[PDB]
Amino acid sequence: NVNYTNNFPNIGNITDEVRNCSFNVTTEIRDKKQKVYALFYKLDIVQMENKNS
Amino acid sequence: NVNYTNNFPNIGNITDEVRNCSFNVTTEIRDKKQKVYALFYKLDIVQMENKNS
Amino acid sequence: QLHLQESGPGLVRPSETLSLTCDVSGGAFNDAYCSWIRRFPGGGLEWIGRISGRDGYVESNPALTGRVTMSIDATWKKIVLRLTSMTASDTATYFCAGETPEDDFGYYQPYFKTWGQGLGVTVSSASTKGPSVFPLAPCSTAALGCLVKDYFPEPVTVSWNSGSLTSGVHTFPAVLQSSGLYSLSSVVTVPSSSLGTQTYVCNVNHKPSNTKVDKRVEIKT
Amino acid sequence: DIQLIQSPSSVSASLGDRVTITCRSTQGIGSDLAWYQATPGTAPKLLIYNSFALHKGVPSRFSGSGSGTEFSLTITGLQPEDFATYYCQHYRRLPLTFGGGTNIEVKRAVAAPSVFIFPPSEDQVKSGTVSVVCLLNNFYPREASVKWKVDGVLKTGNSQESVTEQDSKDNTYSLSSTLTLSNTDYQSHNVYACEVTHQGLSSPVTKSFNRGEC
Ligand SMILES: *[C@@H]1O[C@H](CO)[C@@H](O[C@@H]2O[C@H](CO)[C@@H](O[C@@H]3O[C@H](CO[C@H]4O[C@H](CO[C@H]5O[C@H](CO)[C@@H](O)[C@H](O)[C@@H]5O)[C@@H](O)[C@H](O[C@H]5O[C@H](CO)[C@@H](O)[C@H](O)[C@@H]5O)[C@@H]4O)[C@@H](O)[C@H](O[C@H]4O[C@H](CO)[C@@H](O)[C@H](O)[C@@H]4O)[C@@H]3O)[C@H](O)[C@H]2NC(C)=O)[C@H](O)[C@H]1NC(C)=O
Ligand SMILES: *[C@@H]1O[C@H](CO)[C@@H](O)[C@H](O)[C@H]1NC(C)=O
Ligand SMILES: *[C@@H]1O[C@H](CO)[C@@H](O)[C@H](O)[C@H]1NC(C)=O
Ligand SMILES: *[C@@H]1O[C@H](CO)[C@@H](O)[C@H](O)[C@H]1NC(C)=O
């Protein structure tokens, strides 16, 4: 990222709010699964058992 | 059951009309299944092949 | 029925593969999963990787990330556990238990129904060494003892008078020091009324060496 | 990955008491659990699976309980084979971590330890080593701290311990506290007295040997 970031308000930084999660979805063909990554805000994901999942 | 069961009609009992049916559900460990149980009436289940299934 | 008995090599040199083999008798692991459990002295039990019967697939404890390797063969009564770069902290009683193939509450549930016999394995260099016997005696209720040092391997029987295995025989567990050669103490509790008169012959014997040594307690003043 | 902690790590009870154990998890393992009765020197024997289902053949007094995270076991009557190490095991997800291992023993015949002392013999001097041991006998319970005031300074580390199991006659133990030294250091200091700590006794009894021939 850029460093100075125009720190006029200087409120904070979006780290520790988003998570870079990878998961297996299905492509246009049912018999083919692909692993894809996505950035999700921490308010959209809940933590089930096995805390690293 | 209780013994008397208010034996005024003296017709029969619901056994030989109901069944346990149980089915797999997948779990965390690979090649491990958990049985889910239910009681189904004999009029709602049919035996296709490989008896007791 | 299902019986699991394992012999394997036994004691092996440090940094050498421990290729333990478990024998299945009566039944077969055509569909069940076989597992390895080792039990450290005291402490608890640590699960080792798993193997299937219909297919060749190996699980592994993440602590032993790459040290483990398993094998299965055509007949389903032979199985081998292979460990690489085996360190000096791998003394345990490697058990052999099979996962439950079916149950009221699930299928292939990995709770160990029937265990094996196992074996108490230890690893150490400078292994071969003959026992050395020392006596024990006070200077003036007291007791005596027959210490055995730098012996190998376990165990060493401690015959108190060859018939005095009745009272006060507190045969302590063997101990291992930093030198790698074991020390084993012994004692028989006797009051202060039969000292200096009756001989307390102590015929401590090691099975592979037969260290037949006779000694008695003496009071020196 | 999942750490099971079972309590109490040490408990003692007499015949026919009411004993309870707990095996708390750090993550929810559902109802998946198993209990074992692992006597030392032999393989463990399964008692409970799915945390409440009694195994077949085993005595039916192991009324297990618990669900979710707090799992507990209860015993109504105590057999002579009851007193052994217990382990709680989960099988929710890999790895299959076991428990720490609680201990159950008979709690009777409280008494005070008997302290002994044995200065090394002359033939132990023929070899370049010194074998002096302070023996502990007839004490309850297991835990005890042995001190060695070597001229008032404790050169700790050389005090080895070896405790026999629970007794079948008067329910005691036996620790072998020894400090194996050499001739170049054993003769340097003056006093080698062993002092222990216990509750059933009155004062910690000091045992030593005279400097010289004893
Ligand atoms: C809830 O889930 C559970 C578990 O998922 C489920 O129960 C399973 O149901 C399936 C399907 O019915 C069962 O699968 C069968 O397994 C049979 C055993 O296979 C093993 O043994 C083979 C031969 O060795 C044995 O042979 C005879 C057989 O009776 C025996 O006496 C001998 O003593 C000897 O031990 C062995 O060849 C086989 O290994 C082959 O297969 C694997 C996997 O494909 C392959 O990788 C290997 O290389 C090798 O080729 C295995 O070790 C088996 O006989 C049977 O096979 C029949 O079905 C296939 C496929 O449909 C057909 O091609 C053909 O008709 C075969 O005859 C089948 O594979 C499984 O055992 C159950 N598990 C249990 C009971 O624990 C429940 O049903 C579920 N609940 C529901 C659905 O309600
Ligand atoms: C991200 O936010 C933290 C929180 O204060 C801050 O310290 C850090 O400088 C920000 N930027 C980066 C690149 O970490
Ligand atoms: C996606 O699937 C692949 C192979 O099936 C697996 O290696 C990977 O760990 C999976 N990723 C997940 C479940 O996030
Ligand atoms: C149910 O009815 C049958 C009739 O044949 C009888 O034999 C049985 O005892 C009754 N009760 C139960 C619990 O099955």
mmCIF file with all atom_site columns, C-alpha atoms in Angstrom, chain C residues 51-216:
data_model
loop_
_atom_site.group_PDB
_atom_site.id
_atom_site.type_symbol
_atom_site.label_atom_id
_atom_site.label_alt_id
_atom_site.label_comp_id
_atom_site.label_asym_id
_atom_site.label_entity_id
_atom_site.label_seq_id
_atom_site.pdbx_PDB_ins_code
_atom_site.Cartn_x
_atom_site.Cartn_y
_atom_site.Cartn_z
_atom_site.occupancy
_atom_site.B_iso_or_equiv
_atom_site.pdbx_formal_charge
_atom_site.auth_seq_id
_atom_site.auth_comp_id
_atom_site.auth_asym_id
_atom_site.auth_atom_id
_atom_site.pdbx_PDB_model_num
ATOM 1   C CA . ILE C 1 51  ? -4.592  -46.316 7.844  1.00 0.00 ? 51  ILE C CA 1
ATOM 2   C CA . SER C 1 52  ? -7.635  -47.538 5.932  1.00 0.00 ? 52  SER C CA 1
ATOM 3   C CA . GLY C 1 53  ? -8.347  -51.099 4.866  1.00 0.00 ? 53  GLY C CA 1
ATOM 4   C CA . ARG C 1 54  ? -10.113 -50.823 1.522  1.00 0.00 ? 54  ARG C CA 1
ATOM 5   C CA . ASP C 1 55  ? -7.680  -48.136 0.335  1.00 0.00 ? 55  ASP C CA 1
ATOM 6   C CA . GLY C 1 56  ? -4.126  -47.130 1.097  1.00 0.00 ? 56  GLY C CA 1
ATOM 7   C CA . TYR C 1 57  ? -4.435  -43.763 2.836  1.00 0.00 ? 57  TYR C CA 1
ATOM 8   C CA . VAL C 1 58  ? -2.333  -42.491 5.735  1.00 0.00 ? 58  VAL C CA 1
ATOM 9   C CA . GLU C 1 59  ? -3.223  -39.816 8.268  1.00 0.00 ? 59  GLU C CA 1
ATOM 10  C CA . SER C 1 60  ? -0.619  -38.240 10.514 1.00 0.00 ? 60  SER C CA 1
ATOM 11  C CA . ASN C 1 61  ? -0.368  -36.218 13.699 1.00 0.00 ? 61  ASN C CA 1
ATOM 12  C CA . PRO C 1 62  ? 0.853   -32.716 12.732 1.00 0.00 ? 62  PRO C CA 1
ATOM 13  C CA . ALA C 1 63  ? 3.507   -32.934 15.456 1.00 0.00 ? 63  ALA C CA 1
ATOM 14  C CA . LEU C 1 64  ? 5.016   -35.838 13.495 1.00 0.00 ? 64  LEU C CA 1
ATOM 15  C CA . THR C 1 65  ? 4.657   -33.863 10.288 1.00 0.00 ? 65  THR C CA 1
ATOM 16  C CA . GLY C 1 66  ? 6.944   -35.969 8.098  1.00 0.00 ? 66  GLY C CA 1
ATOM 17  C CA . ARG C 1 67  ? 8.405   -38.655 10.337 1.00 0.00 ? 67  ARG C CA 1
ATOM 18  C CA . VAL C 1 68  ? 5.608   -41.203 9.807  1.00 0.00 ? 68  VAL C CA 1
ATOM 19  C CA . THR C 1 69  ? 4.889   -43.672 7.004  1.00 0.00 ? 69  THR C CA 1
ATOM 20  C CA . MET C 1 70  ? 2.426   -46.573 6.937  1.00 0.00 ? 70  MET C CA 1
ATOM 21  C CA . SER C 1 71  ? 1.959   -49.635 4.747  1.00 0.00 ? 71  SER C CA 1
ATOM 22  C CA . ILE C 1 72  ? -0.784  -52.176 4.057  1.00 0.00 ? 72  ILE C CA 1
ATOM 23  C CA . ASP C 1 73  ? -0.680  -55.249 1.838  1.00 0.00 ? 73  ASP C CA 1
ATOM 24  C CA . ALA C 1 74  ? -2.868  -57.706 -0.080 1.00 0.00 ? 74  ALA C CA 1
ATOM 25  C CA . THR C 1 75  ? -3.992  -59.784 2.879  1.00 0.00 ? 75  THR C CA 1
ATOM 26  C CA . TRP C 1 76  ? -5.477  -57.602 5.608  1.00 0.00 ? 76  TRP C CA 1
ATOM 27  C CA . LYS C 1 77  ? -3.669  -59.113 8.597  1.00 0.00 ? 77  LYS C CA 1
ATOM 28  C CA . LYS C 1 78  ? -0.238  -57.472 8.115  1.00 0.00 ? 78  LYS C CA 1
ATOM 29  C CA . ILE C 1 79  ? 0.534   -53.810 8.836  1.00 0.00 ? 79  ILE C CA 1
ATOM 30  C CA . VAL C 1 80  ? 3.806   -51.934 9.384  1.00 0.00 ? 80  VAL C CA 1
ATOM 31  C CA . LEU C 1 81  ? 4.503   -48.594 11.090 1.00 0.00 ? 81  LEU C CA 1
ATOM 32  C CA . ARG C 1 82  ? 7.569   -46.718 9.832  1.00 0.00 ? 82  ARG C CA 1
ATOM 33  C CA . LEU C 1 83  ? 9.193   -43.746 11.585 1.00 0.00 ? 83  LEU C CA 1
ATOM 34  C CA . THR C 1 84  ? 12.064  -41.653 10.222 1.00 0.00 ? 84  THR C CA 1
ATOM 35  C CA . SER C 1 85  ? 14.680  -39.668 12.169 1.00 0.00 ? 85  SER C CA 1
ATOM 36  C CA . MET C 1 86  ? 13.560  -41.231 15.444 1.00 0.00 ? 86  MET C CA 1
ATOM 37  C CA . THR C 1 87  ? 14.948  -39.119 18.291 1.00 0.00 ? 87  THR C CA 1
ATOM 38  C CA . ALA C 1 88  ? 15.924  -39.998 21.868 1.00 0.00 ? 88  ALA C CA 1
ATOM 39  C CA . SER C 1 89  ? 12.549  -38.899 23.314 1.00 0.00 ? 89  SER C CA 1
ATOM 40  C CA . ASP C 1 90  ? 10.614  -41.766 21.712 1.00 0.00 ? 90  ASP C CA 1
ATOM 41  C CA . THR C 1 91  ? 10.342  -44.245 24.590 1.00 0.00 ? 91  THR C CA 1
ATOM 42  C CA . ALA C 1 92  ? 6.760   -45.486 24.950 1.00 0.00 ? 92  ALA C CA 1
ATOM 43  C CA . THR C 1 93  ? 4.508   -48.551 24.773 1.00 0.00 ? 93  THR C CA 1
ATOM 44  C CA . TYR C 1 94  ? 3.413   -48.523 21.129 1.00 0.00 ? 94  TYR C CA 1
ATOM 45  C CA . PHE C 1 95  ? -0.109  -49.955 21.189 1.00 0.00 ? 95  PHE C CA 1
ATOM 46  C CA . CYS C 1 96  ? -2.215  -51.314 18.328 1.00 0.00 ? 96  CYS C CA 1
ATOM 47  C CA . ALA C 1 97  ? -5.961  -50.637 18.293 1.00 0.00 ? 97  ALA C CA 1
ATOM 48  C CA . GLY C 1 98  ? -8.613  -50.728 15.576 1.00 0.00 ? 98  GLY C CA 1
ATOM 49  C CA . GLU C 1 99  ? -11.358 -48.174 15.038 1.00 0.00 ? 99  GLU C CA 1
ATOM 50  C CA . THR C 1 100 ? -14.975 -49.252 15.444 1.00 0.00 ? 100 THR C CA 1
ATOM 51  C CA . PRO C 1 101 ? -16.427 -50.150 12.016 1.00 0.00 ? 101 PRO C CA 1
ATOM 52  C CA . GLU C 1 102 ? -20.067 -49.599 13.005 1.00 0.00 ? 102 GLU C CA 1
ATOM 53  C CA . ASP C 1 103 ? -22.023 -48.405 16.020 1.00 0.00 ? 103 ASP C CA 1
ATOM 54  C CA . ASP C 1 104 ? -25.488 -47.312 17.097 1.00 0.00 ? 104 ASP C CA 1
ATOM 55  C CA . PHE C 1 105 ? -24.496 -43.657 16.665 1.00 0.00 ? 105 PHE C CA 1
ATOM 56  C CA . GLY C 1 106 ? -22.341 -43.643 13.532 1.00 0.00 ? 106 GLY C CA 1
ATOM 57  C CA . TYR C 1 107 ? -20.052 -45.394 11.083 1.00 0.00 ? 107 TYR C CA 1
ATOM 58  C CA . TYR C 1 108 ? -16.247 -45.664 11.186 1.00 0.00 ? 108 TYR C CA 1
ATOM 59  C CA . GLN C 1 109 ? -16.161 -43.807 14.494 1.00 0.00 ? 109 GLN C CA 1
ATOM 60  C CA . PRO C 1 110 ? -12.504 -43.538 15.617 1.00 0.00 ? 110 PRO C CA 1
ATOM 61  C CA . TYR C 1 111 ? -12.817 -44.619 19.242 1.00 0.00 ? 111 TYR C CA 1
ATOM 62  C CA . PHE C 1 112 ? -10.587 -47.587 19.959 1.00 0.00 ? 112 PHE C CA 1
ATOM 63  C CA . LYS C 1 113 ? -12.654 -50.668 20.762 1.00 0.00 ? 113 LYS C CA 1
ATOM 64  C CA . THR C 1 114 ? -9.988  -53.346 21.289 1.00 0.00 ? 114 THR C CA 1
ATOM 65  C CA . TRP C 1 115 ? -6.360  -52.537 22.046 1.00 0.00 ? 115 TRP C CA 1
ATOM 66  C CA . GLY C 1 116 ? -3.265  -54.634 21.436 1.00 0.00 ? 116 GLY C CA 1
ATOM 67  C CA . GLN C 1 117 ? -0.497  -55.838 23.717 1.00 0.00 ? 117 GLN C CA 1
ATOM 68  C CA . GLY C 1 118 ? 2.193   -53.364 22.694 1.00 0.00 ? 118 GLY C CA 1
ATOM 69  C CA . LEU C 1 119 ? 5.803   -53.273 23.798 1.00 0.00 ? 119 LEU C CA 1
ATOM 70  C CA . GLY C 1 120 ? 7.860   -50.983 25.998 1.00 0.00 ? 120 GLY C CA 1
ATOM 71  C CA . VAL C 1 121 ? 10.497  -49.585 23.654 1.00 0.00 ? 121 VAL C CA 1
ATOM 72  C CA . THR C 1 122 ? 13.440  -47.439 24.730 1.00 0.00 ? 122 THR C CA 1
ATOM 73  C CA . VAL C 1 123 ? 16.107  -45.675 22.676 1.00 0.00 ? 123 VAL C CA 1
ATOM 74  C CA . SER C 1 124 ? 19.645  -44.886 23.838 1.00 0.00 ? 124 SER C CA 1
ATOM 75  C CA . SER C 1 125 ? 23.240  -45.098 22.652 1.00 0.00 ? 125 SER C CA 1
ATOM 76  C CA . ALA C 1 126 ? 26.004  -46.798 24.654 1.00 0.00 ? 126 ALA C CA 1
ATOM 77  C CA . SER C 1 127 ? 23.420  -49.506 25.255 1.00 0.00 ? 127 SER C CA 1
ATOM 78  C CA . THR C 1 128 ? 25.390  -52.685 25.991 1.00 0.00 ? 128 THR C CA 1
ATOM 79  C CA . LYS C 1 129 ? 26.782  -52.565 29.533 1.00 0.00 ? 129 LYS C CA 1
ATOM 80  C CA . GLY C 1 130 ? 26.995  -55.107 32.333 1.00 0.00 ? 130 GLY C CA 1
ATOM 81  C CA . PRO C 1 131 ? 25.471  -54.514 35.760 1.00 0.00 ? 131 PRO C CA 1
ATOM 82  C CA . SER C 1 132 ? 27.597  -53.361 38.687 1.00 0.00 ? 132 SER C CA 1
ATOM 83  C CA . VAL C 1 133 ? 26.414  -54.291 42.182 1.00 0.00 ? 133 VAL C CA 1
ATOM 84  C CA . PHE C 1 134 ? 26.907  -52.156 45.303 1.00 0.00 ? 134 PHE C CA 1
ATOM 85  C CA . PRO C 1 135 ? 25.783  -52.996 48.852 1.00 0.00 ? 135 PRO C CA 1
ATOM 86  C CA . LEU C 1 136 ? 24.096  -50.690 51.338 1.00 0.00 ? 136 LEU C CA 1
ATOM 87  C CA . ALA C 1 137 ? 24.720  -50.518 55.076 1.00 0.00 ? 137 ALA C CA 1
ATOM 88  C CA . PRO C 1 138 ? 24.194  -47.982 57.893 1.00 0.00 ? 138 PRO C CA 1
ATOM 89  C CA . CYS C 1 139 ? 26.910  -46.888 60.328 1.00 0.00 ? 139 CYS C CA 1
ATOM 90  C CA . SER C 1 140 ? 25.059  -47.371 63.631 1.00 0.00 ? 140 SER C CA 1
ATOM 91  C CA . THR C 1 141 ? 14.665  -49.176 62.733 1.00 0.00 ? 141 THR C CA 1
ATOM 92  C CA . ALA C 1 142 ? 17.223  -49.296 59.904 1.00 0.00 ? 142 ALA C CA 1
ATOM 93  C CA . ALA C 1 143 ? 17.463  -51.010 56.515 1.00 0.00 ? 143 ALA C CA 1
ATOM 94  C CA . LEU C 1 144 ? 19.908  -52.240 53.870 1.00 0.00 ? 144 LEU C CA 1
ATOM 95  C CA . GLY C 1 145 ? 19.906  -52.397 50.083 1.00 0.00 ? 145 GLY C CA 1
ATOM 96  C CA . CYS C 1 146 ? 21.493  -53.749 46.912 1.00 0.00 ? 146 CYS C CA 1
ATOM 97  C CA . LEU C 1 147 ? 22.058  -51.067 44.275 1.00 0.00 ? 147 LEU C CA 1
ATOM 98  C CA . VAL C 1 148 ? 22.579  -52.073 40.641 1.00 0.00 ? 148 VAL C CA 1
ATOM 99  C CA . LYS C 1 149 ? 24.243  -49.581 38.304 1.00 0.00 ? 149 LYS C CA 1
ATOM 100 C CA . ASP C 1 150 ? 24.947  -49.249 34.571 1.00 0.00 ? 150 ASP C CA 1
ATOM 101 C CA . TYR C 1 151 ? 22.986  -52.380 33.694 1.00 0.00 ? 151 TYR C CA 1
ATOM 102 C CA . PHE C 1 152 ? 21.309  -53.130 30.375 1.00 0.00 ? 152 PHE C CA 1
ATOM 103 C CA . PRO C 1 153 ? 18.671  -54.022 29.500 1.00 0.00 ? 153 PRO C CA 1
ATOM 104 C CA . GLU C 1 154 ? 15.646  -54.054 31.788 1.00 0.00 ? 154 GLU C CA 1
ATOM 105 C CA . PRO C 1 155 ? 14.812  -55.759 34.038 1.00 0.00 ? 155 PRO C CA 1
ATOM 106 C CA . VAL C 1 156 ? 16.992  -57.018 36.909 1.00 0.00 ? 156 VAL C CA 1
ATOM 107 C CA . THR C 1 157 ? 15.347  -59.262 39.496 1.00 0.00 ? 157 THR C CA 1
ATOM 108 C CA . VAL C 1 158 ? 16.136  -58.605 43.162 1.00 0.00 ? 158 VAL C CA 1
ATOM 109 C CA . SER C 1 159 ? 15.853  -61.850 45.137 1.00 0.00 ? 159 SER C CA 1
ATOM 110 C CA . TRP C 1 160 ? 15.741  -61.019 48.858 1.00 0.00 ? 160 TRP C CA 1
ATOM 111 C CA . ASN C 1 161 ? 17.102  -64.160 50.566 1.00 0.00 ? 161 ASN C CA 1
ATOM 112 C CA . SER C 1 162 ? 15.318  -66.244 47.878 1.00 0.00 ? 162 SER C CA 1
ATOM 113 C CA . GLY C 1 163 ? 12.186  -66.590 49.973 1.00 0.00 ? 163 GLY C CA 1
ATOM 114 C CA . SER C 1 164 ? 12.042  -63.347 51.969 1.00 0.00 ? 164 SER C CA 1
ATOM 115 C CA . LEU C 1 165 ? 9.670   -61.639 49.501 1.00 0.00 ? 165 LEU C CA 1
ATOM 116 C CA . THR C 1 166 ? 7.096   -61.090 52.254 1.00 0.00 ? 166 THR C CA 1
ATOM 117 C CA . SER C 1 167 ? 7.340   -57.770 54.128 1.00 0.00 ? 167 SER C CA 1
ATOM 118 C CA . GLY C 1 168 ? 9.084   -54.442 53.659 1.00 0.00 ? 168 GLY C CA 1
ATOM 119 C CA . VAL C 1 169 ? 10.170  -55.345 50.112 1.00 0.00 ? 169 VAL C CA 1
ATOM 120 C CA . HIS C 1 170 ? 9.927   -51.897 48.509 1.00 0.00 ? 170 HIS C CA 1
ATOM 121 C CA . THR C 1 171 ? 11.504  -52.638 45.132 1.00 0.00 ? 171 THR C CA 1
ATOM 122 C CA . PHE C 1 172 ? 11.590  -49.141 43.673 1.00 0.00 ? 172 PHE C CA 1
ATOM 123 C CA . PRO C 1 173 ? 11.076  -48.477 39.950 1.00 0.00 ? 173 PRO C CA 1
ATOM 124 C CA . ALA C 1 174 ? 14.220  -48.317 37.848 1.00 0.00 ? 174 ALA C CA 1
ATOM 125 C CA . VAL C 1 175 ? 15.626  -44.850 37.177 1.00 0.00 ? 175 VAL C CA 1
ATOM 126 C CA . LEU C 1 176 ? 17.495  -43.434 34.182 1.00 0.00 ? 176 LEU C CA 1
ATOM 127 C CA . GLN C 1 177 ? 20.129  -40.713 34.555 1.00 0.00 ? 177 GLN C CA 1
ATOM 128 C CA . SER C 1 178 ? 21.785  -38.393 32.044 1.00 0.00 ? 178 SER C CA 1
ATOM 129 C CA . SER C 1 179 ? 24.546  -40.966 31.454 1.00 0.00 ? 179 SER C CA 1
ATOM 130 C CA . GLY C 1 180 ? 22.095  -43.308 29.709 1.00 0.00 ? 180 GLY C CA 1
ATOM 131 C CA . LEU C 1 181 ? 22.878  -46.261 31.997 1.00 0.00 ? 181 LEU C CA 1
ATOM 132 C CA . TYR C 1 182 ? 20.157  -47.193 34.451 1.00 0.00 ? 182 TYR C CA 1
ATOM 133 C CA . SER C 1 183 ? 20.274  -47.277 38.249 1.00 0.00 ? 183 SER C CA 1
ATOM 134 C CA . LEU C 1 184 ? 18.047  -49.576 40.311 1.00 0.00 ? 184 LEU C CA 1
ATOM 135 C CA . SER C 1 185 ? 17.820  -49.487 44.105 1.00 0.00 ? 185 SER C CA 1
ATOM 136 C CA . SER C 1 186 ? 16.410  -52.111 46.457 1.00 0.00 ? 186 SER C CA 1
ATOM 137 C CA . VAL C 1 187 ? 15.493  -52.414 50.128 1.00 0.00 ? 187 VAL C CA 1
ATOM 138 C CA . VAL C 1 188 ? 13.958  -54.789 52.659 1.00 0.00 ? 188 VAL C CA 1
ATOM 139 C CA . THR C 1 189 ? 12.642  -53.298 55.900 1.00 0.00 ? 189 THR C CA 1
ATOM 140 C CA . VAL C 1 190 ? 13.974  -55.032 59.023 1.00 0.00 ? 190 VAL C CA 1
ATOM 141 C CA . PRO C 1 191 ? 13.711  -53.895 62.678 1.00 0.00 ? 191 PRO C CA 1
ATOM 142 C CA . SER C 1 192 ? 16.601  -53.261 65.090 1.00 0.00 ? 192 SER C CA 1
ATOM 143 C CA . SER C 1 193 ? 16.389  -56.668 66.800 1.00 0.00 ? 193 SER C CA 1
ATOM 144 C CA . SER C 1 194 ? 17.966  -59.046 64.234 1.00 0.00 ? 194 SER C CA 1
ATOM 145 C CA . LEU C 1 195 ? 21.015  -57.079 63.081 1.00 0.00 ? 195 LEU C CA 1
ATOM 146 C CA . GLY C 1 196 ? 24.464  -58.655 62.942 1.00 0.00 ? 196 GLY C CA 1
ATOM 147 C CA . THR C 1 197 ? 23.119  -62.185 63.513 1.00 0.00 ? 197 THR C CA 1
ATOM 148 C CA . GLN C 1 198 ? 21.033  -63.412 60.556 1.00 0.00 ? 198 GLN C CA 1
ATOM 149 C CA . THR C 1 199 ? 22.569  -63.140 57.097 1.00 0.00 ? 199 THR C CA 1
ATOM 150 C CA . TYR C 1 200 ? 20.581  -61.017 54.634 1.00 0.00 ? 200 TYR C CA 1
ATOM 151 C CA . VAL C 1 201 ? 21.701  -62.690 51.422 1.00 0.00 ? 201 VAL C CA 1
ATOM 152 C CA . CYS C 1 202 ? 20.719  -60.573 48.406 1.00 0.00 ? 202 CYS C CA 1
ATOM 153 C CA . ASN C 1 203 ? 20.956  -62.519 45.142 1.00 0.00 ? 203 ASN C CA 1
ATOM 154 C CA . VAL C 1 204 ? 20.221  -59.804 42.606 1.00 0.00 ? 204 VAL C CA 1
ATOM 155 C CA . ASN C 1 205 ? 20.283  -61.329 39.125 1.00 0.00 ? 205 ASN C CA 1
ATOM 156 C CA . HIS C 1 206 ? 20.190  -59.949 35.591 1.00 0.00 ? 206 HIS C CA 1
ATOM 157 C CA . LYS C 1 207 ? 18.684  -62.347 33.059 1.00 0.00 ? 207 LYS C CA 1
ATOM 158 C CA . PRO C 1 208 ? 21.181  -62.020 30.145 1.00 0.00 ? 208 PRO C CA 1
ATOM 159 C CA . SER C 1 209 ? 24.246  -61.874 32.429 1.00 0.00 ? 209 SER C CA 1
ATOM 160 C CA . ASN C 1 210 ? 23.371  -63.759 35.659 1.00 0.00 ? 210 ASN C CA 1
ATOM 161 C CA . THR C 1 211 ? 25.208  -61.372 37.991 1.00 0.00 ? 211 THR C CA 1
ATOM 162 C CA . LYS C 1 212 ? 25.072  -63.746 40.962 1.00 0.00 ? 212 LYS C CA 1
ATOM 163 C CA . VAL C 1 213 ? 26.681  -61.697 43.750 1.00 0.00 ? 213 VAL C CA 1
ATOM 164 C CA . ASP C 1 214 ? 26.293  -62.308 47.491 1.00 0.00 ? 214 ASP C CA 1
ATOM 165 C CA . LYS C 1 215 ? 26.434  -59.482 50.030 1.00 0.00 ? 215 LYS C CA 1
ATOM 166 C CA . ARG C 1 216 ? 25.298  -58.631 53.548 1.00 0.00 ? 216 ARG C CA 1
#
